Amino acid sequence: GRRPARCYRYCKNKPYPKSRFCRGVPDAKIRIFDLGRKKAKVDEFPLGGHMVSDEYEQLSSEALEAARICANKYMVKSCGRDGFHMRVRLHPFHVIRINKMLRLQTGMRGAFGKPQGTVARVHIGQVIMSIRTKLQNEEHVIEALRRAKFKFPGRQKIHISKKWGFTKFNADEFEDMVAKKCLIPDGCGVKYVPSHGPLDKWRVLHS
Amino acid sequence: GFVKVVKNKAYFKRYQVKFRRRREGKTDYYARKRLVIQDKNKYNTPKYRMIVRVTNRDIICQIAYARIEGDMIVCAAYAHELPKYGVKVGLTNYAAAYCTGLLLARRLLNRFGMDKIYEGQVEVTGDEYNVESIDGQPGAFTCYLDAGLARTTTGNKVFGALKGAVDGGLSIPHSTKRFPGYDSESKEFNAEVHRKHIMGQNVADYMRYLMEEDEDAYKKQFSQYIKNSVTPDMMEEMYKKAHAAIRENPVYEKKPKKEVKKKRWNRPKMSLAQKKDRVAQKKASFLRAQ
Amino acid sequence: TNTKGKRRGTRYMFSRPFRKHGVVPLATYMRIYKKGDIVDIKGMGTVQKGMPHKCYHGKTGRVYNVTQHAVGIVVNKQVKGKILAKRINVRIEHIKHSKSRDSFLKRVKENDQKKKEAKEKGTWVQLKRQPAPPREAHFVRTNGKEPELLEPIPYEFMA
RNA sequence: AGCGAAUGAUUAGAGGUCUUGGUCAACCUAUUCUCAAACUUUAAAUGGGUAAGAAGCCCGGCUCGCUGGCGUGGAGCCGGGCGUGGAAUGCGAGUGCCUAGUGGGCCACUUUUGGUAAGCAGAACUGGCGCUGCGGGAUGAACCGAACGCCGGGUUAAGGCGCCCGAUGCCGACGCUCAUCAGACCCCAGAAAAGGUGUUGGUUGAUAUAGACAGCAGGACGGUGGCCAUGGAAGUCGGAAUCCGCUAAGGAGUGUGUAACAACUCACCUGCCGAAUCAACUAGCCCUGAAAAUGGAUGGCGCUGGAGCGUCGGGCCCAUACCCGG
RNA sequence: AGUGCUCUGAAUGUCAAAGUGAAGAAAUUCAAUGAAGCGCGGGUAAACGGCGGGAGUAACUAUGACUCUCUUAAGGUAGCC
RNA sequence: GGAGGACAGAAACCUCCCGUGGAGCAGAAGGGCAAAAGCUCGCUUGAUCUUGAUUUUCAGUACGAAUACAGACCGUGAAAG
RNA sequence: CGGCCAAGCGUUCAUAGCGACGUCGCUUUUUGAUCCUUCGAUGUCGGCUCUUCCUAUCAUUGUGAAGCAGAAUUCACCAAGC
RNA sequence: GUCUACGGCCAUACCACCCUGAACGCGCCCGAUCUCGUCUGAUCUCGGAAGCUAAGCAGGGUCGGGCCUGGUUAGUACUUGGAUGGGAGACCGCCUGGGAAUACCGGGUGCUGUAGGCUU
RNA sequence: GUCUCUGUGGCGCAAUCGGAGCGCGUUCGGCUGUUACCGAAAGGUUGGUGGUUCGAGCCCACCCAGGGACGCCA
RNA sequence: UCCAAACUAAUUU
Ligand SMILES: [K+]
Ligand SMILES: [Mg+2]
Ligand SMILES: [Mg+2]
Ligand SMILES: [Mg+2]
Ligand SMILES: [Mg+2]
Ligand SMILES: [Mg+2]
Ligand SMILES: [Mg+2]
Ligand SMILES: [Mg+2]
Ligand SMILES: [Mg+2]
Ligand SMILES: [Mg+2]
Ligand SMILES: [Mg+2]
Ligand SMILES: [Mg+2]
Ligand SMILES: [Mg+2]
Ligand SMILES: [Mg+2]
Ligand SMILES: [Mg+2]
Ligand SMILES: [Mg+2]
């Protein structure tokens, strides 16, 4: 079994990712990071609610997919099977280690341990999880992110963004920029079309 | 598309250009590094090099020493100024290479005033000669050869301009292995085969050859010799008259010209204001066309 | 324990700058080093002969010897308890003239220019530069405007 | 910091369409999420080196076997001339001989490595203890203040000022808090997640005399029960529902847990009652969470218009420190 | 087979001092000759000691009398647990 | 890498185009390197004879290794070198 | 040895009794880990005898809860008197 | 106004594509007896001068890509010194001084030395 | 933990010598009245994954499945 | 004096 999670809570070591050097890590528990109808466009699924860490700590990969699951089946149950898109925005890149003991060399002789799991190092203000829905589901994204808090160790705050969706443009100005072709909806996100470049891209934009 | 573009934006963010005069393909910075650079304990002493460059219609010969600002040319002698001395044509063959190197030397030695001190080899043998310095006089002007990017094989014309400059009196360290009269399978130098390349006898034979077999390709290969009436049997003396005319008067005097206006023959850069309304009336005339 | 290797830890020190690889510019070869001038010791990576050891990269010494390709520099080195002067031989790719001296040679050539022309105007001109006096009294015009009121902005939370 | 910059690691859609993939992938282009002790275009703070003159500067000449187109170049030498001593601040400096003891260290702030951690093991930087007393932290190698000849006077530091115990025996200022485990001062000697209609602040939003809120209730629910189905429909439901009362506004149900026409008057009201109220947050103190062995520890006694916590004022108390004196 | 002990000594390989021969002015050097022992060859376990693995197989299953195999100096026998 | 060319295809050889090093340089990793430090030809032995100085580790001792010279003799190159 | 969250289990029904994926603690009867004290010596396992203490309650007194009809049982509270 | 030869700094100079290029030059170009090289006069070497600015090269252009340089980012991130600051901690405020990097938004697109031409 | 070692045709097991095999079995003819012997043919990701190399089953790095051996004062 | 083993449970005279 894995150690209790207060053993690996604070960011004490320097980042130790899997590479040519740290070989043979076990695979992370969380493998799926986006969820809901992923193919939903940007045009009318506008609300974006975040989950922001209040502490500088490191979260296990077991706990990232425990809050992936418990926020999914609340959003499924109350906003439908496809009325949402959630996105986990932490990848478990740091590798934690274990010094297994008890015919080896006893004690702290040779104490550099073996890789044991993966965590995600997280900062103050860093977004943990995002959900985008219809605008009339603000009551439910606040509840699903509140119920994902109980899976994580430290302190988190729930926050409703000012941006449109998962984009980086403010929702106050989003429709005006789509109207005047400063933005172009491609898929989940949006392309910014600047006022420089060759002029044939201006011509095909104003065909 | 299907293939990955190699010249993408990240290709140009990491591209280092070569030097300005490398990517024109004019300078070998490997060779120049060993050629223009003085030993640091011969401190501000110049290090002169003879620069022989052969274009398609001219032979440039010039002595330079290097400075941080750029190379400083001390004396330069061209081959298109040889018709002043009496060689109207064949101004890039081996014979005019000798005449240009001889002109470059004699123009330099009276520039310094050493011209009667170091006379050089007046009668052209074609054999190995070296100017040695005389005690009590100024030393001989010591110089080195910058052939450039030329393939320096035996008979190359840059060694003809060297041979003219040694006979003119300069001190250039050389060997006779790349003069035309050298025989590679014998490692033997003739100095009579080489003498005839100075006098233009390789050309004189081929003129007599095209006279007696083709006579219509003769007017094709030597169309300008016929116009200036340069017979094959008057040519060896035509350079002997030329070399003495060099040694008579090597000084380059030049004519100024003043009566020119400020006529733009090219086109200036468009201002910022002209550039951004040009797009503004392209965007206008695009929407006006629909 | 670390190795006592000659280039241990010079991964970035002796490397080249970005897009400055390749052929050395040729005017680093035609500087002139007299005996007794102050040179900055840096050390390229393109040239491997004659490079100084890593304890001299970024030091500054004066020239005592000049050879065909190199130089002799006297550099102070602080080994543990005492500074001792080291005589090192460096090919001249790795050094450059120091401009720390040349501002002082700019003003010694400025002071002799003004001592034989000081007296006939009765001028006792200032030569000793002084260390930045306090600001003197002055007036500040409002030009009819009033100064803009500043007040702290309320907090809000984004990231 | 960067990754719509190389190298690596990596998530998702989109746009293209060539084909040894079977519409799917692969592929390409533009974007997008998240990373790096052993990656980096960029890039600090702190830092490291040198310099800030007479050993200089400007003039003339001489020497050379080195160098050399040249009276060249370089080094050396000899005269002569120039003091406004060419930033600030502080300070007397140089040099030699002989030489003991030591070569187990430990601790603390910040950076830091191994480890779940450790009063653990290992480094960097400075200070300390060891070698060192004194005042303060009840007590203490190392914390905070300050370093010591033997005394008088005065005044402080850190810390204090109910009584032990010197000093608030101030008509001190404004609040917060009740604890049937209150709390009470660097290191430091005990607690977390999660909760509380306990109280006190605050933030946002909502309703309200075209009368809310809470509580009684006055016509106060029905052809349509549809669609879902005779495992749940002419009251009320584990699956996709979803119009209309012949209205002053109304159920294809939250509501009397339901194979039942079982059967009672919520919902929404205009007069009654006639003035403000509701919700979600948030963080102060307090409480729950909170269990170990001899009987016991804000140091003790005790303290609750404070002798508690927060922000503050004036006094005052004394060290071997500072000051004046022997 | 190992380690011992033992017998045999054939033309036996290795092998000291002295002795013999040659080279040299001599010290010296080289060669020949070769005792035991070692090496080679037998014998010996009531000498020291030692004495296997892997597959498949009976017509319910399961077992495995039998079969095949790598392998060593022999592969633990009568017994007993 | 692309596009082509009898047999010939996922790989034989031929040709053009793109190609900032994504290859290679004996090996570990790091730095360096493009008319090159790479690949291929030509000629060679400077992998030789010398005396000091300096660097690196450092006590500023030695070995090792390394760097600038100087004196010889040489190789190569037209020459600078 | 406890807590929190709540997918599920409990014919129905998250929470009577439970409790996955997570996550937060306490304790010093374990053992690791350490090497601070003792090597000019602290007699070293168990049982026997005997006293006292702890509560994280097995029973008994007083209660609350249930998937508590009665009976039996399970879950909590005050409680270590016996 | 501009080129040639040799450079200095090495993209504000590079890359792609389009347009113009008087006179000189530079080139493409024509040939293989000699010199010298090749499987091949393609390269290299040599001898030329009928043709041509097509290409190189030069000048210009592109809401061009890169590169150079400003703004924003941002007094932000981080950081020297300091406290008997806060907080159970992790971490965080303040004092005293320093002070960045993207994305985003502008501007720019070679300067210049020595020698020699040309341009009326 | 560390170090060695094995892996190859159905089965036991070669070649370790950088340049795919025994025995037995299985098919298939024969002989026989019909089921040893005679004849012939077939068969192998040579554990896996990358390296190195003129070239790998042989040599390197790792993973796996198996083995073996190395420790004692309480 | 070379080797040379075996022979339906499936029955009707
Ligand atoms: K024992
Ligand atoms: Mg060359
Ligand atoms: Mg001591
Ligand atoms: Mg302090
Ligand atoms: Mg037995
Ligand atoms: Mg259930
Ligand atoms: Mg210790
Ligand atoms: Mg005793
Ligand atoms: Mg006792
Ligand atoms: Mg109890
Ligand atoms: Mg040709
Ligand atoms: Mg052109
Ligand atoms: Mg054109
Ligand atoms: Mg641009
Ligand atoms: Mg097998
Ligand atoms: Mg023992």
Side-chain angles (χ1 to χ4, degrees), chain A, chain B residues 1-186 188-290, chain C:
Chain A
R2 61 192 289 272
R3 286 174 188 259
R6 82 277 188 111
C7 293
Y8 299 101
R9 183 178 169 181
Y10 299 112
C11 294
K12 289 172 72 171
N13 295 122
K14 206 175 288 184
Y16 183 64
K18 65 177 290 184
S19 68
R20 190 172 70 250
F21 304 104
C22 183
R23 291 175 293 169
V25 302
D27 189 71
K29 188 71 180 296
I30 174 169
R31 303 293 295 160
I32 297 298
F33 297 94
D34 296 338
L35 188 64
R37 66 182 292 257
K38 299 185 261 75
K39 295 189 291 182
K41 292 179 176 63
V42 70
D43 59 349
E44 204 178 1
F45 305 125
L47 190 147
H50 298 296
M51 189 183 186
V52 174
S53 66
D54 202 5
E55 298 187 358
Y56 178 71
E57 63 183 4
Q58 56 190 1
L59 305 175
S60 67
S61 67
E62 304 291 334
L64 286 177
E65 61 97 21
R68 192 268 305 278
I69 286 171
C70 78
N72 190 11
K73 64 180 69 170
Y74 183 74
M75 291 303 294
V76 160
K77 190 175 67 62
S78 182
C79 292
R81 280 81 65 192
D82 59 346
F84 68 101
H85 179 199
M86 62 180 65
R87 171 173 290 176
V88 184
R89 298 181 64 183
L90 290 178
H91 291 267
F93 283 154
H94 181 74
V95 175
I96 62 172
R97 295 189 295 265
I98 188 167
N99 194 12
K100 290 292 290 184
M101 52 177 64
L102 271 292
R103 48 190 294 162
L104 52 89
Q105 302 296 315
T106 60
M108 293 293 289
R109 169 179 284 167
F112 183 86
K114 296 294 177 70
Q116 191 256 325
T118 57
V119 298
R121 297 163 70 91
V122 70
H123 296 84
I124 316 289
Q126 188 176 2
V127 174
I128 295 170
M129 192 187 295
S130 296
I131 299 171
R132 71 188 177 103
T133 48
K134 297 287 195 179
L135 188 143
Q136 57 94 31
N137 297 326
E138 183 176 1
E139 294 85 2
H140 299 106
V141 297
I142 289 171
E143 182 67 29
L145 293 176
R146 193 191 60 82
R147 295 176 64 175
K149 288 171 71 173
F150 290 94
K151 301 290 188 287
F152 293 118
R155 180 175 175 88
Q156 290 83 14
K157 294 178 185 178
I158 309 303
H159 181 266
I160 305 300
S161 179
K162 302 289 106 177
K163 275 86 167 60
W164 185 275
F166 290 159
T167 64
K168 66 180 182 184
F169 297 94
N170 293 316
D172 299 330
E173 296 294 323
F174 182 80
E175 297 87 355
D176 292 334
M177 294 184 287
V178 170
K180 301 290 105 178
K181 265 68 186 302
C182 289
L183 296 177
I184 289 297
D186 51 358
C188 174
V190 71
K191 293 284 186 69
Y192 183 67
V193 184
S195 291
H196 60 269
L199 194 61
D200 292 330
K201 298 296 181 183
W202 185 79
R203 289 184 179 93
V204 303
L205 192 63
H206 294 90
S207 295
Chain B
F2 184 73
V3 298
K4 181 171 174 65
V5 290
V6 56
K7 297 175 72 176
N8 53 4
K9 178 163 68 172
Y11 172 80
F12 288 111
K13 291 173 73 71
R14 302 189 66 86
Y15 189 81
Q16 182 179 0
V17 296
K18 291 184 181 181
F19 285 179
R20 204 273 317 277
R21 206 167 164 83
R22 169 66 183 85
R23 64 182 187 261
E24 291 175 353
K26 290 183 179 179
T27 296
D28 193 358
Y29 282 96
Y30 185 83
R32 183 184 170 88
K33 188 259 182 184
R34 289 163 175 80
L35 183 56
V36 307
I37 298 302
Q38 189 67 267
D39 291 330
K40 295 281 101 170
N41 57 1
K42 301 179 187 176
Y43 299 19
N44 277 309
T45 302
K47 187 171 185 177
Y48 300 100
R49 62 192 171 99
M50 185 184 175
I51 301 168
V52 178
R53 294 294 191 267
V54 177
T55 64
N56 286 327
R57 290 182 184 91
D58 192 77
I59 301 170
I60 293 101
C61 293
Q62 55 194 2
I63 296 104
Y65 60 98
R67 284 287 179 261
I68 297 172
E69 295 87 3
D71 290 340
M72 302 287 108
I73 305 300
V74 47
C75 178
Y78 289 139
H80 64 267
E81 65 196 7
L82 262 58
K84 188 175 75 69
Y85 295 96
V87 180
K88 275 79 66 176
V89 282
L91 294 178
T92 179
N93 61 7
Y94 191 86
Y98 186 88
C99 291
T100 309
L102 171 59
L103 180 56
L104 182 63
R106 306 302 299 163
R107 187 174 293 174
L108 185 65
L109 296 174
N110 60 350
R111 180 71 59 84
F112 291 161
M114 303 182 292
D115 56 348
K116 293 182 284 291
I117 296 169
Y118 297 102
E119 191 70 31
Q121 193 185 12
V122 174
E123 296 297 324
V124 178
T125 308
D127 200 0
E128 187 175 4
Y129 180 72
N130 285 318
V131 179
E132 60 186 3
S133 295
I134 301 170
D135 292 331
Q137 302 299 320
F141 185 80
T142 307
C143 190
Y144 310 108
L145 184 67
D146 189 3
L149 293 181
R151 184 69 184 92
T152 57
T153 322
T154 299
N156 190 351
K157 281 179 278 193
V158 302
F159 301 104
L162 178 146
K163 182 64 182 171
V166 176
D167 295 338
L170 295 188
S171 176
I172 294 169
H174 66 277
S175 177
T176 61
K177 187 180 175 183
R178 304 298 176 186
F179 289 152
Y182 177 77
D183 192 77
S184 66
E185 64 272 16
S186 177
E188 182 69 29
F189 180 68
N190 198 356
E192 286 293 327
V193 166
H194 172 252
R195 183 185 175 271
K196 287 190 263 75
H197 283 82
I198 289 113
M199 309 319 295
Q201 296 300 110
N202 54 357
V203 179
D205 293 334
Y206 181 58
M207 292 177 69
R208 284 191 289 267
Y209 183 70
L210 256 49
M211 281 179 180
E212 70 182 4
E213 273 93 13
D214 299 337
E215 189 62 33
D216 201 2
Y218 175 71
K219 295 179 182 178
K220 183 179 180 181
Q221 180 64 248
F222 297 104
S223 175
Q224 297 291 318
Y225 289 4
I226 302 166
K227 187 172 74 65
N228 297 112
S229 296
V230 180
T231 304
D233 297 329
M234 67 175 286
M235 191 177 294
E236 185 178 2
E237 60 92 17
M238 189 267 289
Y239 294 105
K240 291 181 185 294
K241 187 174 177 181
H243 305 306
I246 298 295
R247 294 184 180 272
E248 181 71 31
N249 206 170
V251 181
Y252 182 72
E253 61 92 19
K254 68 181 184 178
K255 180 68 182 67
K257 189 176 176 182
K258 176 64 175 65
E259 60 275 20
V260 296
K261 294 181 181 179
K262 187 70 166 64
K263 201 263 179 64
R264 298 282 295 170
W265 289 104
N266 52 359
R267 183 175 170 174
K269 281 181 182 175
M270 284 174 63
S271 65
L272 178 64
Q274 289 181 350
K275 282 184 182 181
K276 61 171 65 173
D277 64 334
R278 181 182 176 179
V279 59
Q281 59 189 358
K282 284 178 184 294
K283 288 188 284 187
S285 71
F286 181 77
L287 297 176
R288 187 170 62 198
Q290 70 185 4
Chain C
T1 299
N2 299 323
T3 72
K4 52 182 74 174
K6 286 178 189 175
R7 287 185 63 175
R8 174 176 61 82
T10 55
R11 179 176 185 176
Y12 302 104
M13 172 184 283
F14 290 160
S15 72
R16 298 297 295 154
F18 185 65
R19 294 186 288 112
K20 292 184 73 66
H21 295 271
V23 182
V24 184
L26 211 65
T28 72
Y29 284 136
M30 56 183 73
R31 305 293 178 181
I32 303 303
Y33 297 105
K34 305 289 184 69
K35 296 180 187 289
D37 55 357
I38 311 299
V39 295
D40 288 327
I41 300 167
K42 193 175 181 181
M44 297 177 63
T46 311
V47 178
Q48 292 85 25
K49 301 289 285 183
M51 51 167 64
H53 186 259
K54 59 186 174 184
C55 58
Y56 298 107
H57 178 84
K59 304 294 185 288
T60 303
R62 67 175 171 87
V63 168
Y64 76 98
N65 190 12
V66 179
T67 63
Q68 277 84 18
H69 307 91
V71 79
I73 303 166
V74 181
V75 191
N76 291 325
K77 186 185 181 182
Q78 196 265 328
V79 308
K80 55 181 72 66
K82 59 192 182 299
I83 300 168
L84 79 168
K86 302 296 287 293
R87 289 175 185 267
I88 67 169
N89 297 120
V90 173
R91 291 177 75 95
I92 53 97
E93 289 87 358
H94 307 287
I95 59 168
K96 64 184 187 294
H97 291 286
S98 73
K99 292 187 287 183
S100 66
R101 194 71 190 275
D102 293 336
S103 71
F104 173 66
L105 293 174
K106 187 266 298 296
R107 57 190 295 270
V108 172
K109 301 293 185 182
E110 192 273 340
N111 293 323
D112 60 349
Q113 195 277 130
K114 282 172 66 179
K115 293 298 103 175
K116 81 278 191 183
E117 68 178 4
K119 274 79 63 175
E120 69 271 17
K121 271 73 66 175
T123 300
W124 184 72
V125 75
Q126 186 65 255
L127 301 183
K128 297 187 175 182
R129 62 194 195 277
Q130 292 293 320
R135 289 189 295 269
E136 72 273 11
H138 59 282
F139 287 86
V140 174
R141 296 172 185 263
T142 61
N143 290 313
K145 292 180 66 62
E146 67 177 357
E148 299 293 327
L149 186 62
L150 300 180
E151 70 273 14
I153 58 170
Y155 178 74
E156 65 171 2
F157 181 73
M158 285 79 72

